Amino acid sequence: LQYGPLAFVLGERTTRKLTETSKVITVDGNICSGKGRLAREIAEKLGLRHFPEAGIHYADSTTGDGKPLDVQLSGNCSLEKFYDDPKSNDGNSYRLQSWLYASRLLQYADALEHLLSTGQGVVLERSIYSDFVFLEAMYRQGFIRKQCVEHYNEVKKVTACEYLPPHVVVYVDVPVPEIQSRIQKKGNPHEMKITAAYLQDIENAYKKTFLPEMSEKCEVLQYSAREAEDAEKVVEDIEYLKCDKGPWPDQDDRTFHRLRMLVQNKLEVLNYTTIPVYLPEITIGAHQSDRVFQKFTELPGRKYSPGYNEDVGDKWIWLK
Amino acid sequence: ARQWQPDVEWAEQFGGAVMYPTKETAHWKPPPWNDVDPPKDTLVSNLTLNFGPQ
Amino acid sequence: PTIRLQEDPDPEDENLYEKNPDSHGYDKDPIVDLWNMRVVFFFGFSIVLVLGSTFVAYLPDYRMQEWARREAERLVKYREANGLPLMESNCFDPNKIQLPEDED
Amino acid sequence: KFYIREPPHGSPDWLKVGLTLGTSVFLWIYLIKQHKEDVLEYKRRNGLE
Amino acid sequence: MLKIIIPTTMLLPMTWMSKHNMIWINATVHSLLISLISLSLLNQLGENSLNFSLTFFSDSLSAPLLVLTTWLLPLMLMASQSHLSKETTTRKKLYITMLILLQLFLIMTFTATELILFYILFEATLVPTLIIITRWGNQTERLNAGLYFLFYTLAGSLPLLVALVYIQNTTGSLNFLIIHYWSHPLSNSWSNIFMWLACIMAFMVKMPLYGLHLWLPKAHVEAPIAGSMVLAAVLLKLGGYGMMRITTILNPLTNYMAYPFLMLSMWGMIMTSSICLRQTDLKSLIAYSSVSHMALVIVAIMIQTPWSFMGATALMIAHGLTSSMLFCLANTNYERVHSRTMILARGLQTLLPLMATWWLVASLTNLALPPSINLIGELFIITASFSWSNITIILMGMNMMITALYSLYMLITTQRGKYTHHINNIKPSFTRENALMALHILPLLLLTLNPKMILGPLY
Amino acid sequence: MPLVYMNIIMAFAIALAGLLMYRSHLMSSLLCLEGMMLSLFIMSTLIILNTHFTLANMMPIILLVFAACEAALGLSLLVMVSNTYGTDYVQNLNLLQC
Amino acid sequence: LLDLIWLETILPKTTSFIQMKMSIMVSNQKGLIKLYFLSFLITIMISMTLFNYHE
Amino acid sequence: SDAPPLTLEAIKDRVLYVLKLYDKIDPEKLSVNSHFMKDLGLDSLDQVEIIMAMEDEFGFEIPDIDAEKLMCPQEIVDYIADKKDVYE
Amino acid sequence: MNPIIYTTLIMTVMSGTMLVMISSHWLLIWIGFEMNLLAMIPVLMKNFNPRATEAATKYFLTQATASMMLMMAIIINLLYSGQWTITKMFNPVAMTMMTMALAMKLGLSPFHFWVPEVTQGISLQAGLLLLTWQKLAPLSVLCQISQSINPNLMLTMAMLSILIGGWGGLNQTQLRKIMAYSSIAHMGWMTAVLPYNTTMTILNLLIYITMTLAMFMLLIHSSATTTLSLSHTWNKMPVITSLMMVTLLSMGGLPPLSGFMPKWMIIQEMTKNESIIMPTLMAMTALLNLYFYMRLAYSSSLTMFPSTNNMKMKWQFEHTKQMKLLPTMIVLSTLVLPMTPALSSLN
């Protein structure tokens, strides 16, 4: 049965499933750092569910078939062209940033739902509390306008306040020259154009805003470049953490009920992402919106509800 | 060559707090997107008491 | 961006004669176009127009025009033969009309 | 095809479908019986037959 | 008469169950068949009407209107499929649904035996028309036009409703037959004057009367071609039909309550005919032409004589056909050049000769050339007005000149002279447009052949 | 009517006018509400005693009970208002217009 | 002069202007309970003096 | 509506009025271009008090820097206009 | 709030309404009103925020004042006639005070100011409850004491309600305030026919409740509280906007929609008595409500407004919670006029 007030009235309580390994974990770091590998090793060692960093096509991976859709029908933004022309006059940069924030919000909702439904811990790469640093890096470099920052702040203020911050924040420090060396040795021809000022802005935003304000909610585990490959030592450091200072211990059954009703029903999660603030970078005309929506509705498994599309092999429709 | 449809300028007529703005209501602001006003810093001062010496 | 919004450009109009030199102006698909023309011409001119005009032209006389003419001929013959006036100023017999007693 | 469970599977929920058809048929036969008895009572009260 | 009503309600799901590329063919074929079926209502009696049931009846005044409506639906379908080619299937089906619902409401309106039912249907006709105008119109004025189309109607019709129910609480019946047989004279009191005004103003604003006509140019200019067709050819005749029906209970108050409306009708007929002489918009010229002709019809109905009623009926039928043809002719040029200015595309007789012939025939019929039914109606109305008062022959005569002028003006502006040099996108006329013109014009002369079918019950 | 009845009616009218005309404090308006309740209690008791309506003698008590509920309700609301503004002023309740 | 100005001025434009003015008059309230509770007091007195006194 | 759109002339009038209310400045010798230290003969502390008087008058706070270099009434007017974004 | 506590509070609200509806004793009706207010106050503050607290405080003050006037009217009636049964209200001053108190409870003009504020300050579900269920009890009492009403005062308040509803709703961009002003106008319509026929009042109330339920469920389904946020729905689910437009047309009273049936019937009823001028003015004034319904229909269904990019993400998800009574409510709101004579079953 679908979770709701009825399941809460008789039986279901979230507090009982929490077994000292709930522990929402995020592993933050600058561009091209080995935060992903550390996250996978932490999840493997502690037996938690690992969530790869949410990209442009994260929402596609969870609906219908997990394969991504066309960029015209999903995202409508490019990271490659953001690297090529960060100061483009078609609003690609802030469109990408807003879409990425929406994707991160959806991923955080999914992780919270899984944790509250099964009691198993989760490990995320970045979070909605960390996305803003990239926005800041876009603003100092002149890639986006100030109105875009105001719109981002409005959306974040109305959205991110409804959830619980992660239990423990893991941050990996890599100096900018080493990051540039890693980028040069990588080979992706679009990331060679990342100037050192952009990475310096990202690191400045991280170390000056995110870590201080996140440390007030809960302690932060910082690791240099060399002491992140030893994932066993990192896990054993995480395990002996005294987590009794954040909002998490102050959560009872009814608050968990509210949060669990919030995390499912993804439309309510994404409600305030499309607020009617008309920025040229994200506002789309009526003709283009109509054409793109008609294009989207013609996809093989999208015209009807999930179980009612006979063109992808749905049977017994006339009795469902 | 195609049908006219509303644009941002047309849509912005309906985004204010009231229709037909006047001089008095030009400073009314629309409610927050969620119905949550930001908390005012109405600090309450505690009582200061002398305990002793007498 | 110096722009106001993301919008498609206004597209140029399509000429139906380019892909179909004999296009009849009904549809872009030549077969559906030809059959739309055929049904319009058959059911508009052949069926409704000519047959409907023939049906209207031969509608039976429910307005009783010929009957009225024959009745008038009978009445004229009778009243002329017996010397009565052809018409009377009163269409109702005064014997069945009861005027008010007092006019003063 | 769907990456998710899609709780409505290829087979329809047979309990709900059966309950729906049963309720509908019960309502229809109840209506027919009620109409028959109403007709009989009306004829008896007015003494047509 | 359900043999006509039910096939339209069947046109509805047939359109909604059709294959995506066969909607127009099915709709046009079955609409033509329904028109052929409705042709049988022309067989009328000489004494009373065709009383099919307690709800519906057919008379010698409503049968030509029903035939015109059922004949106009397929013409709208052909005239609409050009500019709706890029639309989605669902919206095309919705447009056809609006057209079918409008036809159904008009069919039920023209045959209702009851005045409250007539009011309900004659008011229900607004919703499909308003939706069509405000959804499928082209420019941003359409929204305003819809509002102008709506409230102008409702402010006239809501008082009528009150009057109607008041009558039903006094006489006990609003059935038209009982109302006719149990008719009694209206006294001369203020209450009777306001009851007369309430009963008359709705149909006078739907005509429209001069001074109350401001909604009509907006509605007929911003509407799509099918919307303009149905607004000009049928929806304006609701006022005339309703006035001819309701005037049976207003005597002898009309004898002196018609003076302001007669004065407005005559002087505003002159005024609108003059307005047609200086019009930069080709659609607005046709709209004001409709205003002038309907002013003539108002005069005919208001003077209350058998010849006037005959002429009024003939004029409504002829004006419907002629104005629909003129709107379609203007829409062809608009679709070619995407502009409504009359002096933009000139000298079109050189480029489109058969279209020029269609234009010539439409303009000749508009100026009431003998022996067209336009002339028959106009001449009957003029003779009745002359009997009413000999001085009217001045004003009427004035109109007869002015009409001709502006009519030929339009032709001389659009077909003669030299072609505009920079306009090079004028393709040859399609078979669809020529067939539309022919199906508009042939019934006109065919009815000229047998004119007693459109002369109404007073014949 | 005797003079006592009209005195009680005057007390009720005074309390009603006091509620309808707010100064600044919500507590004063709540006190005016309780005054209305007290006047209603006194008048109902006087009418019931005068006519010896025995079974209606329980009616004033019930009245008092629901008065308490209203009072409690009002006080509860006052608390929340204070917690939002540090004051119980009615000019702070102006977020919603007409 | 007539079609585009005065016929427009009298019937529709005057109606729209009057309705807009009355809408602005009616809907522009500050949301203070003090003011319209005072209005409630005035209304109650007016009702007891106008309609109630005449029975 | 809110307060009228304050202009440069009103700003200058208020600044001069506040300055002539200072008990240690003679009204006649004071002008819009008079330097506090040289023409008016005031050391740093009177300048601080004058800045605080401007703070009271216009209802906004001027830091130690910024206010440390307002040397005559014209600079105070310019600073107030720039902070309030007043161009007329 | 706990689901069990919420269910208990909702059931207590309905129990107070039923106690008002099934009692013959004035004290029990007053107790039902008190219980309804007591259980309703927390329901308005289910989602805690300053606006909800302000709405609850204003509602409590208004309803407590109204209940005190109610009890005073009961006591005056008892003083001039030792009766407790709800009947022809043997005293005129007590009846004037009763009419004023019930009008204040219903929100009739000029005691209308609290309705838009309270509707705007609470959530859509609480507004649904307040604008649909909270009208039953005062209207039931008014129906029970209809023979002793003063027609002048009642008709004045009804006409003022219609006028003020139209004029106030003309100026709104917030959907909740639009609903509140529509509610005020519809209460005016309901109370205009009350002195002449209570069956017409019940019919109008039923049709208004059906239409309001459909409107509020459509507004909850597409999470919009402003005009601009509603203008986005066409790019996410156009069927909802089309149904909303047809519902708005029905609320505007256009034939052949069912929203035409109440006013029509009321007009006819008011013409069976003499009463000619008042229905004409009433229809003229209802044209204003129709105007701003048409403006909403223009903004949401008949034209396409610009959208945002993030809406693409919303294309990939379906509505999770599903309202089972929405289709029936829409159908009853629109296609019900041909079944008009069935109103005989109401009396």
Ligand SMILES: CCCCCCCCCCCCCCCCCC(=O)OC[C@H](COP(=O)([O-])OCC(O)COP(=O)([O-])OC[C@@H](COC(=O)CCCCCCCCCCCCCCCCC)OC(=O)CCCCCCCCCCCCCCCCC)OC(=O)CCCCCCCCCCCCCCCCC
């Ligand atoms: C290509 C078109 C492009 C587009 C354009 C737009 C077109 C739109 C069309 C839309 C659809 C239209 C449908 C309308 C339906 C109308 C049908 C109808 O009602 O029929 C009525 C009418 C038939 O009357 P009826 O009531 O049915 O008959 C009653 C009697 O019982 C009968 O009397 P009877 O017992 O004597 O029998 C007579 C019988 C037989 O009588 C005879 O045979 C005798 C004739 C006399 C000859 C005698 C001597 C000749 C031979 C001598 C030598 C041989 C004999 C010896 C051998 C040895 C040789 C020496 O002949 C007839 O029945 C008449 C012919 C029937 C025609 C019907 C028309 C149907 C039209 C429907 C289709 C429309 C499309 C057109 C297609 C048509 C084909 C192209 O048809 C006519 O038109 C009659 C007109 C002929 C009269 C003469 C003209 C007089 C002119 C005077 C005016 C002068 C002024 C200038 C004006 C000039 C203008 C001409």
Ligand SMILES: CCCCCCCCCCCCCCCCC[C@@H](O)O[C@H](CO[C@H](O)CCCCCCCCCCCCCCC)COP(=O)(O)OCC[N+](C)(C)C
């Ligand atoms: C392209 C080039 C064209 C030019 C060349 C053309 C070649 C010649 C063709 C032209 C024909 C010339 C006309 C000459 C007149 C002959 C026809 C006439 O005699 O028929 C009339 C008959 O005409 C018909 O009655 C009129 C036709 C009805 C019109 C209905 C139109 C079809 C309906 C479509 C929808 C309508 C929409 C409008 C709403 C009302 C006779 O009337 P009536 O005096 O009785 O007959 C008495 C004898 N009867 C009764 C035994 C028959």
Ligand SMILES: CCCCCCCCCCCCCCCCC[C@@H](O)O[C@H](CO[C@H](O)CCCCCCCCCCCCCCC)COP(=O)(O)OCC[N+](C)(C)C
């Ligand atoms: C923009 C175009 C819109 C359409 C216009 C519609 C036209 C409506 C005009 C109504 C026609 C006549 C109305 C009343 C009939 C007579 C008018 C009156 O002038 O005649 C005299 C009336 O006498 C005086 O005039 C008294 C009436 C004066 C007050 C009326 C106000 C006129 C002001 C004009 C304002 C413009 C109205 C249109 C607003 C849009 C007759 O004397 P009397 O015998 O005693 O009255 C007859 C009735 N009896 C028998 C019961 C007694």
Ligand SMILES: CCCCCCCCCCCC(=O)SCCNC(=O)CCNC(=O)[C@H](O)C(C)(C)COP(=O)(O)O
């Ligand atoms: C109610 C009464 C209570 C009284 C309490 C009083 C409290 C007294 C606290 C005093 C604290 C000090 O001494 S603080 C020490 C002050 N001494 C110095 O600064 C030495 C250098 N002198 C200068 O800089 C100039 O002479 C200067 C005077 C600054 C003028 O500044 P300008 O020329 O650049 O404008």
Ligand SMILES: Nc1ncnc2c1ncn2[C@@H]1O[C@H](COP(=O)(O)OP(=O)(O)O)[C@@H](O)[C@H]1O
């Ligand atoms: N919020 C963001 N804004 C812009 N670019 C981002 C954002 N998040 C991730 N990226 C881009 O995604 C790319 C890979 O992400 P990253 O996690 O840093 O490397 P890796 O996948 O090796 O761990 C990088 O080029 C980074 O710039």
